[PDB]
Design a binder for this molecule. Structure first.
Ligand SMILES: *[C@@H]1O[C@H](CO)[C@@H](O[C@@H]2O[C@H](CO)[C@@H](O[C@@H]3O[C@H](CO)[C@@H](O)[C@H](O[C@H]4O[C@H](CO)[C@@H](O)[C@H](O)[C@@H]4O)[C@@H]3O)[C@H](O)[C@H]2NC(C)=O)[C@H](O)[C@H]1NC(C)=O
Ligand SMILES: *[C@@H]1O[C@H](CO)[C@@H](O[C@@H]2O[C@H](CO)[C@@H](O[C@@H]3O[C@H](CO)[C@@H](O)[C@H](O[C@H]4O[C@H](CO)[C@@H](O)[C@H](O)[C@@H]4O)[C@@H]3O)[C@H](O)[C@H]2NC(C)=O)[C@H](O)[C@H]1NC(C)=O
Ligand code: 2QM
Ligand code: 2QM
Ligand SMILES: *[C@@H]1O[C@H](CO)[C@@H](O[C@@H]2O[C@H](CO)[C@@H](O)[C@H](O)[C@H]2NC(C)=O)[C@H](O)[C@H]1NC(C)=O
Ligand SMILES: *[C@@H]1O[C@H](CO)[C@@H](O[C@@H]2O[C@H](CO)[C@@H](O)[C@H](O)[C@H]2NC(C)=O)[C@H](O)[C@H]1NC(C)=O
Ligand SMILES: *[C@@H]1O[C@H](CO)[C@@H](O[C@@H]2O[C@H](CO)[C@@H](O)[C@H](O)[C@H]2NC(C)=O)[C@H](O)[C@H]1NC(C)=O
Ligand SMILES: *[C@@H]1O[C@H](CO)[C@@H](O[C@@H]2O[C@H](CO)[C@@H](O)[C@H](O)[C@H]2NC(C)=O)[C@H](O)[C@H]1NC(C)=O
Ligand SMILES: *[C@@H]1O[C@H](CO)[C@@H](O[C@@H]2O[C@H](CO)[C@@H](O)[C@H](O)[C@H]2NC(C)=O)[C@H](O)[C@H]1NC(C)=O
Ligand SMILES: *[C@@H]1O[C@H](CO)[C@@H](O[C@@H]2O[C@H](CO)[C@@H](O)[C@H](O)[C@H]2NC(C)=O)[C@H](O)[C@H]1NC(C)=O
Ligand code: NAG
Ligand code: NAG
Ligand code: NAG
Ligand code: NAG
Ligand code: NAG
Ligand code: NAG
Ligand code: CA
Ligand code: CA
Ligand code: CL
Ligand code: CL
Ligand code: ZN
Ligand code: ZN
Ligand code: ZN
Ligand code: ZN
Lengths: 694, 694
């Protein structure tokens, strides 16, 4: 029989291991020849595996690269202008790769060029609240200073945005062992910790969903009209560069001015973590100088797009996508995900060769230039937006399959919650101590829901990966799942060797997943979800789960507002319409669920499947969120303070945020009321898509 | 049998006549009690007629009304400030209605209040080219002047916008007998011409598709947040008031300054048509003073929405809509259309009582507040946008059924051309001399296509009626048809008694359509289109017709650009991508047509019907046109100089318009290239929706 069990049994750990090895021998940086050759390899193999069509879709987008003959570095310079200390020009390469060429040195992609020299101020994680503490409580002025911030807690692009608005003239990012060195584990190559010479690469854009900075709204195809650089979307205006903790220690050890305001500002290095500005008395005349010579350049990128045509509903698309480009070898990010995708394609292709086809069309994607701003997935979605919005059922992402070996991590739309719970009850746990138990059981035990006993935690989607255009722009139900660690305060910081030259095949095979059993479990979750979405007669979405969360998010936003009871009285700020809409949604969803259970008629079925598919789409506002026109989902957007975190009712959240500091309270509360009206209207309109159609 | 012939035969001229009489005895001004009582009457009757559900949808929108105890008028005042001449406070009422109350006096809806006094300048029709002639060729400065303009040629709101940008401090609009008095016909009540005391009412907004000025984007429901008046959309900033030609003669006869520049500036009154500024020597010290005291006020409006549920595809909607509100009695505009709609509902209801239902759902609408800015249809579409965009097949408008008695007039999307040609070949001509001939034959004879021999003229949709939100915002295939005159230069000016107190039942019954045969023919066209759209197994749209017009519009926009060959060389302005996209669309459409003719499989049918329904939707750009975010269709928008006229490739058209006058030619041609890229991309993306789906 050709059922889900046949699909799942065909998946093999040893194939995933072979593919991961094959994908991680040389760097695959976006826009380079090596990554184009990998794209051609994948296209060839997906054809062999049995897909109906496999094409490359290419775009010409703005990328950023260091200058190979003019390296980036930071100095401490004395009053004579002698550079008395320099940061490293490259990470020491790992064993057996000291002769690989084309390893890009650490840099912050899209940094402008410059050689700013100044006094340092230390800004902790450079979060919005860190800058509030500095400026409002400690009265420290960052204007004209170089800021130094530790990586962690929030997306680095938010750090740079915050530093810019504070008037910084440059930013130095570094990895503190407090956040990137787990106690009791050895540094790479002897364990999975970050060495003092290791450095985290990564872009520092603030694109807000735009895609290629030069072509917002439209695909960067051959005849595209491009904005000039000065009008490009999301580029930083000050130079930025990342360093490891050996180098950071040299920059921080001389720091003077104010003590850190409290212990949450101190990392694990043997330095005082003084905030500055500038160095202590003896070194008061030394300055820090950046030298950044990176260049932005329009460069061709390639997505691989494979199609397995549906037998019954070929005009309904279930998409499984993950990126192929890596900063260096990509042992975890992204090739641990790409190897899982490759084995899923292989498995579906095996069934196809035996005569089976899915009910709906499945599209498989190997995206390019994810690391430079989700460019490949966003350009392709801009090109195909009309097909996706009328035909897109679901998007399942597949970046890193593992970032630890403790338990499952899932973020998805509430419409997928029931699907995830049901699938994981049918899968075997790979965990020690849970042999013969379900993955649901182990996951629920290790990661309990904060609301409901006997259920696991599933989080909101944020951004920082390729599902963003599909979910936040186009309103296609999306999900993602991987294996993770037990390290809650580090849930947005990355694993220790994230985006470093040390993230290699050997890292994974020695320290994370020697038997490839966690990879295999993630392949069964991602693959199983795709199978059910593409094959279930009725789409496996439960609208009642959206009704439950909408009440939770309404209670939450109401509670934030109620911190300001006098203003709510003065400006007549009522959440009544929003609660009314949520109540109506709950009632209508309950009635729709009853009909869905209660109907041989394929028109009524498809009518009902269209109601299910277009429910996520109903939360899209075509006017977008304030000053973020490509974030259109009214219930969820990436947090304005941390692109990685999802925020619920973001329009109302941002209208309320720091409202006690706004100079015109009448205008600020007016905008809160406006966002409540938009949210109540959208929830009611989404509910009405589930009413009887006539 | 229940087929189209049964539907058509049930329609009766004498029922249309009864309904028109019933709808035109008292004024039905939007927001008044009388119009609410008519809405309740219609709701009751549509229920009786047999619709499944008939509800009122209400909104609270900004309307405008004169002050009943402080009337609007214009004076000529002498140097002492004595008002030596006053315009009329009301139109003399027609015979037998001198005792009807609540006839709104002539006013320009949404005019601000003010009492500006100044010298007059005469600006012909106040078109963009009229103001170019004044300012650029004649060197006359309108700044601080009161402008007087004759109605005609373009929408009055464009006149007021043009006068504002020229620096006018007020506008006087009047009806010249050249445009509103056909030679050889008598004035009302003895013929259908405009008397010298007659005055054309009408709004002077520049909404660009926004709907209610206070709630752009969202329905004006009970909890809506409203913009303050100073941020409202589209309100004029200078006072405006309309007058008849007896009063205009008094204002124009004393005019001095420059002679009219040529004969196209002279109307038919016995005055010189001097342009001014100001009066001749003897009267040089007299001024003109406006007194405008109208008020804008948020007021409830009511749409009637009737549903006839589809038997097979109830989640596909064919909508027949027309407005109910009138300036005064609405004998032609809109009740000649509303009476046709009422008889169509009656006919469909007769079939329904015999057990028939259409394949698809038909929605029938009686819109309110059309005259104040398409408010009722736009608010309702904003409320229901998610249902309409995923389920809307087509919208057929039904305002005035007659504006003359000569031949058919049709404006529609190219997707409906084949449908209109085929239907009119099956209908009888009502025209004298064509008894026993088809309507197609008479229409083709009287209104030949300017391109093809043996075909009739069908025009582009513009705006100025309730189809605008459905077509230009949401991208639902739309059409309209009425009987018209033979008076080509007056095709945007209105019939002589347009928006006057004289547009009565007696006007229609005595002078336009005594046998109601032209009404009946229009009911067969509108009703027939609705029947075919709601009942045909395959939707009756031909994508190849869009391919033909896209080539025509591409040739046209290329020819405009080619007036500037040196700039096209300097800035490398190429239309190659646009022609490439049009060629691809032609090829793909031809292949799709072949498949559509070549497939018992209801999935493939509906897949194909969805391709047809979503083709118009593919021309929508979610980012809208430049500074007109609610005009989203890339192929068609209302002309920026004349809201009534459609413009093709409007983004490129407006980028090219008057380009030789822009100060930064590099920037201006850059924007032309940007609009060519958006248009080529959109055409190619629309084409791709017709490719095989997987
Ligand atoms: C959740 O669903 C419910 C339906 O179950 C829906 O209820 C609707 O609420 C609206 C807004 O409150 C009601 O609007 C009223 O409609 C009547 C006519 O039906 C009007 O006469 C009312 O206006 C008068 O009263 C107002 C309030 O004091 C005054 O401001 C006004 O000037 C008038 O005097 C009012 O517009 C509507 O009837 C119901 N519909 C029903 C019960 O079917 C509710 O709105 C949904 N929630 C959301 C957020 O959409
Ligand atoms: C109309 O449909 C046709 C398909 O029938 C479609 O043709 C496509 O045109 C594009 C754009 O011209 C082609 O793009 C080329 O793709 C190849 C690889 O396939 C690239 O190597 C090419 O790039 C090189 O050449 C360029 C031009 O000189 C250089 O600028 C560039 O730097 C490279 O050296 C180029 O990108 C594409 O192959 C075809 N696709 C086909 C034939 O299937 C056409 O674009 C459609 N029209 C519109 C407006 O969409
Ligand atoms: O590296 C990225 N993403 C990794 C690391 C993300 C670190 C924080 N982790 C999470 O947000 C997270 C949440 C839920 C799950 I299930 C898994 C990870 C990832 O998604 O695996 N994306 C890069 C980056 O962060 O530099 C990125 C970020 C922004 C952008 O526009 C384009 C690319
Ligand atoms: O009166 C209106 N429409 C009438 C008169 C339009 C006069 C010009 N005629 C046409 O544009 C036309 C084109 C094709 C056909 I078939 C029929 C008429 C109508 O459409 O019958 N609409 C009113 C107005 O013009 O004051 C209007 C205008 C703008 C607006 O936002 C809201 C209402
Ligand atoms: C990764 O695996 C691929 C596919 O097996 C290898 O590419 C093949 O290499 C052989 C021997 O050079 C050629 O004959 C084939 O044409 C290739 N097939 C393709 C590209 O589809 C590739 O060598 C492996 N890469 C590494 C680093 O081991
Ligand atoms: C840090 O690097 C800088 C730049 O290479 C070094 O300064 C240069 O030293 C060479 C030879 O000694 C001079 O000819 C250059 O003119 C210097 N350039 C600049 C920009 O100062 C510096 O010596 C290095 N410092 C340390 C401690 O290694
Ligand atoms: C997850 O599994 C549950 C339990 O099987 C499914 O809920 C059942 O669905 C069937 C079919 O409609 C009903 O007859 C039962 O009454 C349901 N049991 C319940 C609600 O406890 C549920 O549909 C599955 N979720 C999916 C497929 O998304
Ligand atoms: C227009 O026609 C309607 C419907 O026939 C008339 O309204 C009816 O009036 C009678 C007598 O007053 C009442 O008994 C009914 O209740 C009404 N029916 C409705 C409103 O559905 C109305 O009188 C006519 N109007 C004019 C001006 O002739
Ligand atoms: C035009 O109307 C104005 C306003 O009603 C007339 O002027 C008024 O005349 C009365 C009585 O004669 C005075 O008490 C008012 O003070 C005047 N008002 C203003 C604003 O001037 C004027 O007489 C009328 N002119 C003509 C020719 O009829
Ligand atoms: C209008 O009528 C023409 C002539 O009947 C229709 O075109 C024919 O359609 C049938 C069914 O597909 C074909 O088999 C013929 O070959 C067509 N004749 C032609 C193209 O000359 C056309 O489909 C009708 N248009 C509609 C319904 O929109
Ligand atoms: C990189 O630096 C070299 C060496 O100084 C210089 O000649 C070249 O212009 C730079 N490359 C760029 C800016 O792409
Ligand atoms: C910070 O310093 C800059 C540069 O001198 C100054 O212009 C600015 O006003 C200062 N801001 C505060 C809040 O002290
Ligand atoms: C794998 O799991 C073991 C057992 O708990 C743990 O000690 C080890 O560090 C894990 N590896 C990683 C990378 O977390
Ligand atoms: C209309 O004019 C009257 C009479 O002068 C005045 O009292 C009232 O304020 C006005 N009504 C308005 C502005 O609605
Ligand atoms: C028109 O007159 C105004 C008012 O005095 C003046 O400011 C403006 O510059 C003039 N414009 C032209 C084009 O002469
Ligand atoms: C009706 O048609 C006749 C015959 O051509 C014409 O003389 C008459 O004026 C028409 N009525 C109108 C309003 O056009
Ligand atoms: Ca783009
Ligand atoms: Ca509105
Ligand atoms: Cl992922
Ligand atoms: Cl019409
Ligand atoms: Zn990644
Ligand atoms: Zn990454
Ligand atoms: Zn009308
Ligand atoms: Zn009108």
């Amino acid at each position: 029989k050709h059922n889900m069990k046949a699909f799942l049994d065909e998946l093999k750990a040893e194939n995933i291991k072979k593919f991961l090895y094959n994908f991680t021998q040389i760097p695959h940086l976006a826009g380079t020849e090596q990554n184009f050759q990998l794209a051609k390899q994948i296209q060839s193999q997906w054809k062999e595996f049995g897909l109906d069509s496999v094409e490359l879709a290419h775009y010409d987008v703005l990328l950023s690269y260091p200058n190979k003959t003019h390296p980036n570095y930071i100095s401490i310079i004395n009053e004579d202008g002698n550079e008395i200390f320099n940061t490293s020009l490259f990470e020491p390469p790992p064993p057996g790769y000291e002769n690989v060429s084309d390893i890009v040195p650490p840099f912050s992609a899209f940094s402008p060029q410059g050689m700013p020299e100044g006094d340092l101020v230390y800004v902790n994680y450079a979060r919005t609240e860190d800058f509030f503490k500095l400026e409002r409580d400690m009265k420290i002025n960052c204007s004209g200073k170089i800021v130094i911030a530790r990586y962690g807690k929030v997306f680095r692009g938010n750090k740079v945005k915050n530093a810019q608005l504070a008037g910084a003239k440059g930013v130095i990012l570094y990895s503190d062992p407090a956040d990137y060195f787990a106690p009791g584990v050895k540094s790479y190559p002897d364990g999975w910790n970050l060495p003092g010479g290791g450095v985290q690469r990564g872009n520092i854009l603030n694109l807000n969903g735009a895609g290629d900075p030069l072509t917002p709204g439209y695909p960067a195809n051959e005849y595209a009209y491009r904005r000039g650089i000065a009008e490009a979307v999301g580029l930083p205006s000050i130079p930025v560069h990342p360093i490891g903790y050996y180098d950071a220690q040299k920059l921080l050890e001389k720091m003077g001015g104010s003590a850190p305001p409290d212990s949450s500002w101190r990392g694990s290095l043997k330095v005082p973590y003084n905030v500055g500005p500038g160095f202590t008395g003896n070194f008061s005349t030394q300055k820090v100088k950046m030298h950044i010579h990176s260049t932005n350049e329009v460069t061709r990128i390639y997505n691989v797009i494979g199609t397995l045509r549906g037998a019954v509903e070929p005009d309904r698309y279930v998409i499984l996508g993950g990126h192929r480009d890596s900063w260096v070898f990509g042992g975890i990010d992204p090739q641990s995900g790409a190897a899982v995708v490759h084995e899923i394609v292989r498995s579906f292709g095996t069934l196809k060769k035996e005569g089976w086809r899915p009910r709906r069309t499945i599209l498989f994607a190997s995206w390019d230039a994810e690391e430079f701003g989700l460019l490949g997935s966003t350009e392709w979605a801009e090109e195909n937006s009309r097909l996706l919005q009328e035909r897109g059922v679901a998007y399942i992402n597949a970046d890193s399959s593992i970032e630890g070996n403790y338990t499952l991590r899932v973020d998805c739309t509430p419409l997928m919650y029931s699907l995830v719970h049901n699938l994981t009850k049918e899968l075997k746990s790979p965990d020690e101590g849970f042999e013969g138990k379900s993955l649901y059981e182990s996951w629920t035990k290790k990661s309990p829901s904060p609301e409901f006993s006997g259920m696991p935690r599933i989080s909101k989607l944020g951004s920082g990966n390729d599902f963003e255009v599909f979910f936040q722009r186009l309103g296609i139900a999306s999900g993602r799942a991987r294996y993770t660690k037990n390290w809650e305060t580090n849930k947005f910081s990355g694993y220790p060797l994230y985006h470093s030259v040390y993230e290699t095949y050997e890292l994974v095979e020695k320290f994370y997943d020697p038997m490839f059993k966690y990879h295999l479990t993630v392949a069964q979750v991602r693959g199983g979800m795709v199978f059910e979405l593409a094959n279930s007669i009725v789409l496996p979405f439960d609208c009642r789960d959206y009704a439950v969360v909408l009440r939770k998010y309404a209670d939450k936003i109401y509670s934030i507002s109620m911190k300001h009871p006098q203003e709510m009285k003065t400006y007549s700020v009522s959440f009544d319409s929003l609660f009314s809409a949520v109540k109506n949604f709950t009632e209508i969803a309950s009635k729709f669920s009853e009909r869905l259970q209660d109907f041989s008629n394929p028109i009524v079925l498809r009518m009902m499947n269209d109601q299910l598919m277009f429910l996520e789409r109903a939360f899209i506002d075509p006017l977008g969120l304030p000053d973020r026109p490509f974030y259109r989902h009214v219930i969820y957007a990436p947090s304005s303070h941390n692109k990685y975190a999802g925020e619920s009712f973001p329009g109302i959240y941002d209208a309320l945020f720091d409202i006690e500091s706004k100079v015109d309270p009448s205008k600020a509360w007016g905008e809160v009321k406006r966002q409540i009206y938009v949210a109540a209207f959208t929830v009611q309109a989404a509910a009405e898509t589930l009413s009887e159609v006539a």
